[PDB]
Design a protein around this ligand. Structure first.
Ligand code: CLA
Ligand code: CLA
Ligand code: CLA
Ligand code: CLA
Ligand code: CLA
Ligand code: CLA
Ligand code: CLA
Ligand code: CLA
Ligand SMILES: CCCCCCCCCCCCCCCC(=O)OC[C@H](COP(=O)(O)OC[C@@H](O)CO)OC(=O)CCCCCCCCCCCCCCC
Ligand SMILES: CC1=C(C/C=C(\C)CCC[C@H](C)CCC[C@H](C)CCCC(C)C)C(=O)c2ccccc2C1=O
Ligand code: SF4
Ligand code: SF4
Ligand code: SF4
Ligand code: FES
Lengths: 130, 158, 73, 745, 99, 38, 58, 80
């Protein structure tokens, strides 16, 4: 699922020594557009597939959200590079955007009551619940 | 009497008449009579003298520091110092308290009441104004009519 | 001395005012009806619904030590 | 080419001057045009009043809203200038002031005796009563040479008609004839007329006013002629030979100037320099020489840029050719930056007109321009401090719109590898080395003030930093004063007197009162200038962090998508409170008052100790505070005791006098300052739940408004604690400065 | 209460109707009163699911809070704050078309 | 309408009422100054 | 119930014991099948709401 | 280590997933209203707790409660 490619830029405000979490936002373009790197600056965006290593996942999503609005392309993929070298395939989670409704339903963290219907914190005494 | 001495006959209060006009006459002796700065001081001389004859006939009650004092122990002899100022105060405080309530019922029965609170209906705001000298015999009737206070099961509450 | 006890009784009622608000609105309100599920000392509820800085009952405590030192001062 | 494309492109009658959009407010935005359902709508009506980029995306009708609104601004200046010249006519003692301006106090305000407020009208001499006043128009009107009372009455009615033309001009440029964006993007011609036909003719016709009017008036005033007995200003024009009895060069005429015998005009266009000991100010013939010196090369600097007729340095081409090895692509792209967004232009214009007015405050106290302003120490103190704070306020606005441009009008597609992009790329190394040097300065400036305070407290006075201690002598600043006293004769050989008497030379005293003494910079000024170097560096630490982290950061990578002025991005990432570029201006404005109060405190103690005072005819000099800046200025208790506690005695022992209005403002701005911290320390969600109790108290009584009474929003709540703090941080420095120097001086 | 006509058309499902509305009634309320199902979330102007595109006509859409200035410049109107002040023809099912 | 209905906006209809209701207190202090009573 | 004003009974909303204005009652077995509108807008700037059929008193 | 559980009002107004800049909200089809979808929160370990769902949430009060508990280097948002 990963591959060696490039991104094409210059920069001086990026990831430090970081070895717990990194990634690669990889996408295919269509033209030599100029886009803001979410840590700052600009880049040149080669028209094939190209990737970006950045530090933490807020920069990775905000480059994936900026690529969707301007020069619209629904093909950005987001991995996660561990210090040992394992990949994750984090963001679309099965081939599609989460604003589209899936057919694979996990359905977790779904309480089945209104937000007033929650117990008093005296009833959760010396244990962990809402 | 009622504690301290009256300032109708008080030597320290009469001393505050004395050295104030003695201070103010020292400004007068550097000018010439006939100039408009001369008339601005001598007219300001007499408005301090007549002020000191206003408090003498008013029957204010102070001593030991030459000032005037006031008594708010509900005294009807001292009713001119606090009570009838407050009775004119609480009179048409209760204008603005009542006609603001009277304005805020007929403005709710409108098409767009949100714009109408800063874009005034001046024939209605003056139309609800001058029924305000006769508020508390109508506000007490409003208190015993029933709809001055809405019920507790229909208010906004946490 | 008449007027300056009213400066104390201003600060007596106002330090009571933050904290009887601070006691009785720890549970819920219209701005946050589920404040009990968050706890006594939480930061805020975010910038939503108008913005919600100093909403907790700890931050309702926090303003009165300004007013307590203002009162006993 | 633009061989006919510098022309006027004007729409005829764009907007009908009507009344239906005049009374339906909130009409400039989609989010405000549908009425006040909440009380955010009233506070958004004022905040979006001048936010024109949130009104329309069409830059043509943005720029027509700018150009008509300047006429509304310039009509306010002429209406305010009419209030100064009319109160010189009917409400003044200026015509009595010219017969003896050495001891008669200025007055321009007669208070109505209503509530017993007539005690503020003090005995200011001249057979006249009124408020002692300190803006210094009286020494301006002697500098221009207005003698009688009629000319002040004619200028204010000539200024009111100049406002009525200027108010009409903004009406004409939005409702009858409005320019297009082609006209506004002709910036290579706008810098031509502004350099030449605004500042050159603004100097050259003013040099005509100074030579022909203000030099024969101020040559006859200081001789001792009464101002009723001076000939009129239209007698120094139609009678050339009356000017010849003052300056003999006017018997020749215009032929030395035309045939370039310009040394014949040396008798009234001189290079004396220094001061004038008869009238207490600058030599007016030097000032008459200074203006047409600037005129004859502002008009030379007017014809620099490319115009309709071929020649001229093109502004797109001198910027593009400044590329370098370190700087990447150079300035390729900045000309399209500055002729599109006004916020980019306002961010450079506010730093200049801010930090030209700080140059005004420093080039006025040590070179007093106006006659008989040198003895009047209240006017020197008020004209210093007011030109500081405008230069202190307008410099933080340079980083306001420096950050507003980045989130709105900065397109990174047009800015690949140019000079603006490269500092967004290395914005860590900009701030961190600025972050190091503020901790370096504040340990080395404020830490010495603790270190002199401890050594005085611990008894051992031989271990502080003073003259009789470990000396920190400012050897650079003591050296340049020894250069400018060799500036007569040696380095500028035709300057007769000194460039300024503050560097050295001789004292000048006018009627006993000291006009100017040499300032001896000692070891207590090595530290307080390093205070000034510290707190200036912290203000650019917040503000340049506000510009460079306006787009994004490592906290927020899409900060520009939320806007310029937003509260936060949640209490996640540990908390993002005050994260916008608005709050960097809000944090940076506070350290400006924490800067500029020290600059005017350094002014108000050094000039009360070393230059101002009294001079005995033997030559004995006795200052006001006795020269206590040599020892007591080096400790923070000495700034508390000998300056803050000691000089405020004229403020608070001033009841029953004419300065008693200042004691009320001195208690007025302690109050508003401690009204700020309710708006500043607390949050919003407390008060919204506190308002929630009060809406119950009205909905019980059928008294609730149809609009929703809400708490103030968080950027709005930080702004009202900001403006209260700067009223109560400035207004009590105002009411202590003016009350001290009018009393003791 | 005036009378106005809105020609709604969804080509993804293929339904073309002509509905009648007033100045106070919303557009999808008139679509529900003629028996046409339309996507919606809570009828507030604060979502994206109820987006239609004004092909022809004039719509007072001003009571919404989701869509910004430029995204309504192309003509994307939420059908739940819309006061139809003209006789219009509207393309619907444009919930993905705004973003 | 619409110019006198511009003089029904709450600041400007406030201010010409506030010019009135300030000056009611000013001119009673013209003719009766120095009043602690009545 | 179509049409007229319906007061609420649930807490934890902005509109508690207020007047209400019902619109388009739903029939699908949804837990909250009324999408009742209001005046006097909330903290979010949303004048509408949906709640259940157990809080009507009309 | 937050806890961003979604309650039972939950109308499927698909903008909380849009306003989430961390993809920790995800729509799940669910029997209910005419939208026929609910908002689910799988990536509670991956969230930052920046409360961006709650600002775009036009229910009675907050279909997606956020309430912040535990934390890590992911949720605290450090680039080092
Ligand atoms: C607890 C404080 C208090 C309160 C609420 C009042 C209240 C009042 N007093 Mg009062 N009064 C007070 C203390 C107080 N007084 C004191 C300490 C004295 C001195 C013993 C008086 C002597 C006094 C007199 C002599 C009169 C009032 C009167 C009044 C009434 C007008 C009002 C009900 C008047 C009235 O009608 O009440 C009897 C009146 O004539 N007061
Ligand atoms: C229609 C006008 C009106 C009326 C009848 C009331 C009535 C009341 N208010 Mg109130 N209030 C008002 C306007 C009004 N308010 C406004 C405009 C504000 C915002 C500044 C407040 C802020 C406020 C607070 C913060 C508190 C009250 C409280 C109270 C209650 C106790 C009385 C008191 O101390 O008043 C308080 C009065 C003020 C603080 C200042 C008066 C406000 C303005 C000047 C009055 C409005 C004048 C307006 C122009 C009238 C329009 C008429 C005409 C022009 C058409 C009482 C029920 C207190 C409470 O809950 O007690 C139960 C309380 O704590 N009010
Ligand atoms: C008497 C001296 C003098 C001379 C020789 C010139 C000569 C020139 N001026 Mg100039 N100018 C003068 C006085 C003079 N000006 C004055 C008194 C002002 C007002 C302060 C200006 C303001 C001015 C502007 C604003 C512009 C010129 C421009 C020009 C150039 C082209 C004008 C033309 O005829 O085509 C030309 C070099 C134009 C140009 O292209 O500048 C290089 C232009 O835009 N001048
Ligand atoms: C030599 C001609 C000349 C002069 C004197 C000015 C003077 C001015 N311009 Mg201007 N301008 C000029 C040519 C000139 N401009 C040209 C040719 C262009 C087009 C390229 C522009 C484009 C321009 C813009 C876009 C703006 C200005 C602005 C200003 C004002 C700046 C405020 C200031 O410095 O305070 C000094 C103030 C004074 C000295 C006040 C006295 C002004 C008197 C009335 C002289 C005005 C001369 C005027 C050009 C005559 C117009 C002819 C008309 C009668 C038909 C000032 C009044 C700014 C402004 O404030 O807008 C109004 C602004 O936004 N100008
Ligand atoms: C730009 C403003 C201005 C104006 C309107 C005038 C106007 C005039 N000057 Mg003048 N002048 C000016 C600037 C000006 N000057 C400057 C800057 C200088 C110094 C170089 C002079 C030096 C000067 C001399 C030396 C004389 C005039 C004279 C005159 C008058 C007849 C020619 C005329 C009223 C003559 C005069 O006194 O009137 C007959 C005369 O002898 N001027
Ligand atoms: C050349 C001058 C200049 C100009 C034209 C602008 C223009 C603008 N600024 Mg700006 N700014 C300036 C200088 C300037 N600024 C300076 C010098 C600073 C630093 C202090 C700032 C700081 C600043 C911020 C932080 C913000 C702006 C914003 C704005 C925009 C809208 C402003 C608005 O609607 O306010 C309407 C007018 C007011 C609200 C007036 C309030 C009056 C204040 C409180 C002072 C009153 C004190 C009074 C004079 C003395 C005491 C009174 C007494 C009662 C005690 C607009 C583009 C805002 C924006 O949205 O940008 C797009 C914004 O967020 N500016
Ligand atoms: C008097 C109150 C005060 C003090 C001392 C500080 C101190 C500081 N602020 Mg600050 N600030 C304040 C109020 C204050 N703030 C307020 C009210 C605001 C809101 C407007 C801010 C907003 C603010 C911003 C926005 C910024 C600062 C910055 C700074 C730093 C400046 C660098 C410096 O001088 O460090 C040197 C430290 C001192 C001079 C403190 C005194 C230390 C003495 C000299 C010696 C130490 C004592 C002892 C020997 C230590 C050892 C013993 C101990 C271990 C027990 C510094 C830590 C800047 C920053 O953080 O980056 C540099 C910055 O950008 N401030
Ligand atoms: C000296 C500074 C100062 C002042 C005046 C106030 C004033 C007030 N605070 Mg406050 N507060 C402050 C500092 C200050 N705070 C600080 C530092 C904190 C800590 C963060 C707080 C925390 C705080 C809390 C937590 C609470 C208050 C409350 C109150 C109110 C008390 C009721 C009262 O006295 O009614 C009288 C009102 C005043 C004395 C305010 C000043 C009114 C002026 C003098 C008159 C009106 C202005 C006048 C029109 C002048 C013309 C202005 C011109 C521009 C036209 C009042 C508004 C309580 C409250 O709101 O309950 C209702 C409350 O719960 N405050
Ligand atoms: C101004 C001094 C800056 C030194 C620049 C030295 C110099 O010649 O730089 C010149 C260099 C650019 O030169 P280039 O070769 O790129 O020339 C091309 C461009 O100049 C034209 O496009 O700028 C930088 O290196 C950026 C980093 C400067 C570092 C700035 C530090 C600021 C703090 C020092 C300020 C001291 C002031 C008081 C002194 C007592
Ligand atoms: C007290 C306080 C409030 C509450 C303040 C409010 C609600 C302002 C109330 C006063 C306004 C300005 C009254 C305006 C009334 C009009 C002037 C009309 C009056 C009638 C005549 C004068 C015309 C906040 O909203 C807030 C927000 C953020 C941080 C701190 C605070 C804060 O400390
Ligand atoms: S309001 Fe203050 S606290 Fe609540 S989120 Fe925004 S910043 Fe953080
Ligand atoms: S935000 Fe509230 S409404 Fe929109 S989906 Fe999540 S829960 Fe349903
Ligand atoms: S929690 Fe923070 S991130 Fe997850 S959705 Fe709500 S706001 Fe967006
Ligand atoms: S349907 Fe949710 S906003 Fe219109």
């Amino acid at each position: 699922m990963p591959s060696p490619t490039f991104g094409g830029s210059t920069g001086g405000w990026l990831r430090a020594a970081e070895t717990e979490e990194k990634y690669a936002i990889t996408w295919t373009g269509k033209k030599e557009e100029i886009f803001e790197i979410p840590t700052g600056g600009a880049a040149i965006m080669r028209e094939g597939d190209n990737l970006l290593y950045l530090a933490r996942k807020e920069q990775c999503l905000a480059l994936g959200t900026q690529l969707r609005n301007s020069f619209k392309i629904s093909d950005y993929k987001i991995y996660r590079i561990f210090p040992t070298g394992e990949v994750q395939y984090l963001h679309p989670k099965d081939g599609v955007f989460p604003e589209k409704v899936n057919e694979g339903r996990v359905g977790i963290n779904n309480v089945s009551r209104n937000i007033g219907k929650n117990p008093n914190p005296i009833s959760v005494k010396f244990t962990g619940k809402s | 009497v009622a504690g301290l001495v009256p300032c109708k006959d008080s030597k320290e209060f009469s001393r505050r008449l004395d050295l104030s006009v003695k201070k103010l006459e020292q400004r007068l002796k550097k000018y010439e009579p006939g100039t408009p700065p001369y008339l601005a001081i001598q007219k300001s001389i007499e408005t301090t003298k007549i002020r000191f004859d206003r408090y003498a006939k008013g029957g204010l009650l102070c001593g030991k520091d030459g000032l005037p004092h006031l008594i708010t122990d509900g005294r009807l002899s001292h009713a001119t110092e606090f009570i009838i100022p407050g009775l004119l105060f609480l009179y048409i405080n209760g204008w603005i308290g009542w006609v603001g309530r009277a304005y805020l019922i007929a403005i709710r029965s409108s098409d767009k009441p949100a714009e109408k609170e800063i874009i005034l209906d001046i024939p209605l705001a003056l139309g609800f104004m001058s029924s305000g000298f006769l508020w508390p015999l109508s506000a007490w009737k409003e208190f015993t009519s029933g709809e001055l206070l809405v019920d507790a099961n229909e208010v906004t509450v946490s | 001395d008449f007027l300056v006890h009213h400066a104390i009784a201003l600060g007596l009622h106002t330090t009571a005012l933050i904290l009887i608000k601070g006691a009785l609105d720890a549970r819920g309100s219209k701005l946050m009806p589920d404040k009990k599920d968050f706890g006594y000392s939480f930061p805020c509820d975010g910038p939503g619904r108008g913005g919600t800085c100093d909403i907790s009952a700890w931050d309702a405590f926090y303003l009165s030590v300004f007013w307590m030192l203002n009162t006993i001062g | 080419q633009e061989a006919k494309k510098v022309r006027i492109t004007v729409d005829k009658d764009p907007v009908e001057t009507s009344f239906e959009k005049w009374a339906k407010p909130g009409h400039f935005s989609r989010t405000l045009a549908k009425g006040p359902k909440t009380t955010t709508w009233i506070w958004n009506l004022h905040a979006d009043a001048h936010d024109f980029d949130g009104h329309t995306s069409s830059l043509e009708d943005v720029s027509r809203k700018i150009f008509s609104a300047h006429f509304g601004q310039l009509s306010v200046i002429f209406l305010w200038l009419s209030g100064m010249y009319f109160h010189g006519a009917r409400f003044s003692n200026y015509v009595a002031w010219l017969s003896n301006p050495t001891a008669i106090k200025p007055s321009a305000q007669v208070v109505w005796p209503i509530v017993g407020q007539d005690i503020l009208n003090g005995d200011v001499g001249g057979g006249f009563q009124g408020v002692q006043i300190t803006s210094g128009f009286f020494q301006l009107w002697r500098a221009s040479g207005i003698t009688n009372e009629k000319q002040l009455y004619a200028t204010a009615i000539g200024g009111l008609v100049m406002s009525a033309l200027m108010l009409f001009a903004g009406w004409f440029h939005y409702h009858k004839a409005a320019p297009k964006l082609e006209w506004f993007q002709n910036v290579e011609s706008m810098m031509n007329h502004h350099l030449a036909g605004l500042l050159g003719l603004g100097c050259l016709s003013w040099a005509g006013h100074q030579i022909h009017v203000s030099l024969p008036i101020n040559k006859l005033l200081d001789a001792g002629v009464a101002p009723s007995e001076i000939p009129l200003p239209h007698e120094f024009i139609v009678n050339r030979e009356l000017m010849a009895q003052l300056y003999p060069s006017f018997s020749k005429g215009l032929t030395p100037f035309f045939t370039l015998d310009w040394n014949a005009y040396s008798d009234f266009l001189t290079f004396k320099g220094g001061l004038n000991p008869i009238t207490g100010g600058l030599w007016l013939s030097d000032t008459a020489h200074h203006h047409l010196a600037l005129a004859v090369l502002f008009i030379v600097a007017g014809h620099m840029y490319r115009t309709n007729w071929g020649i001229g340095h093109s502004m797109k081409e001198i910027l593009e050719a400044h590329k370098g090895p370190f700087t990447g692509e150079g300035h390729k792209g900045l000309y399209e930056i500055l002729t599109t967004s006004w916020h980019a232009q306002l961010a450079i214009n506010l730093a200049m007109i801010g930090s030209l007015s700080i140059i005004v405050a420093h080039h006025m106290y040590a070179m007093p321009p106006y006659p008989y302003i040198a003895t009047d120490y209240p006017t020197q103190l008020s004209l210093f401090t007011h030109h500081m704070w405008i230069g202190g306020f307008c410099v933080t606005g340079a980083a306001a719109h420096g950050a507003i441009f980045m989130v709105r009008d900065y397109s990174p597609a047009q800015n690949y590898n140019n000079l603006l992009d490269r500092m967004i790329r290395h914005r860590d190394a900009i701030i961190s080395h600025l972050n190091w040097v503020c901790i370096f300065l504040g340990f080395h400036s404020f830490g010495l003030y603790i270190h002199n305070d401890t050594m005085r407290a611990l008894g051992r006075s031989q271990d502080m930093f003073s003259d009789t201690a470990i000396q920190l002598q400012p050897i650079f600043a003591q050296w340049i004063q020894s250069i400018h006293t060799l500036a007569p004769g040696n380095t500028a050989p035709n300057a007769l007197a000194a460039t300024s008497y503050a560097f050295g030379g001789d004292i000048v005293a006018v009627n006993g009162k000291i006009a100017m003494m040499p300032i001896a910079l000692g070891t207590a000024d090595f530290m307080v200038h390093h205070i000034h170097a510290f707190t200036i560096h912290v203000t650019v630490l917040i503000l340049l962090k506000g510009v460079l982290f306006a787009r994004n950061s490592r906290l927020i990578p899409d900060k520009a998508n939320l806007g310029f002025r937003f509260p936060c991005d949640g209490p996640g990432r540990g908390g993002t409170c005050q994260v916008s570029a608005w709050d960097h201006v809000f944090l940076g404005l506070f350290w400006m008052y924490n800067s500029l109060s020290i600059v005017i405190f350094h002014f108000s103690w050094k000039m009360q100790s070393d230059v101002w005072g009294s001079v005995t005819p033997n030559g004995a000099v006795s200052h006001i505070t006795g020269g206590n800046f040599a020892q007591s200025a080096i400790t923070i208790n000495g700034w508390l005791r000998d300056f803050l506690w000691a000089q405020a005695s004229q403020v608070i022992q001033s009841y029953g006098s004419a300065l008693s209005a200042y004691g009320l403002i001195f208690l007025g701005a302690h109050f508003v300052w401690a009204f700020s911290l309710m708006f500043l320390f607390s949050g919003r969600g407390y008060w919204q739940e506190l308002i929630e109790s009060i809406v119950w108290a009205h909905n019980k009584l059928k008294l609730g408004p149809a609009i929703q009474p809400r708490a103030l929003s968080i950027t709005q709540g930080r702004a009202v604690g900001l403006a209260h703090y700067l009223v109560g941080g400035i207004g009590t420095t105002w009411a202590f400065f003016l009350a001290r120097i009018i009393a003791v001086g | 209460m005036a009378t106005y006509k809105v020609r709604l058309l969804s080509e993804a499902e293929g339904i073309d109707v002509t509905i009648d509305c007033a100045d106070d009634v919303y557009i999808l309320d008139a679509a529900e009163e003629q028996g046409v199902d339309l996507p919606y979330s809570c009828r507030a102007g604060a979502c994206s699911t109820c987006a239609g595109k004004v092909s022809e006509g004039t719509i007072d859409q001003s009571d919404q809070s989701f869509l910004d200035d430029d995204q309504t410049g192309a003509g994307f109107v939420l059908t739940c704050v819309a006061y139809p002040t003209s006789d219009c023809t509207i393309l619907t099912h444009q919930e993905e078309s705004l973003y | 309408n619409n110019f006198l209905k511009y003089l029904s906006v709450m600041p400007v209809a406030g201010t010409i009422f506030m010019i009135f209701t300030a000056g009611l207190v000013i001119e009673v202090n013209r003719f009766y100054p120095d009043a602690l009573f009545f | 119930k179509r049409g007229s004003k319906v007061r609420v009974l649930r807490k934890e909303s902005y509109w508690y014991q207020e007047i209400g204005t019902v619109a388009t009652v739903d029939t699908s077995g949804i837990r909250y099948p009324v999408v009742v509108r209001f005046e006097k807008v909330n903290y979010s700037g949303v004048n509408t709401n949906n709640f259940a059929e157990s809080e009507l008193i009309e | 280590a937050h806890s961003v559980k979604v309650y039972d009002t939950c109308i499927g107004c698909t903008q909380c997933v849009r306003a989430c800049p961390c993809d920790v909200l995800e729509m799940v089809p669910w029997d209910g209203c005419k939208a026929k979808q609910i908002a689910s929160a799988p990536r509670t370990e991956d969230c930052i707790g920046c409360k961006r769902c709650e600002t775009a949430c036009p229910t009675d009060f907050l279909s997606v409660r956020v309430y912040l508990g535990g934390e890590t280097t992911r949720s605290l948002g450090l680039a080092y």
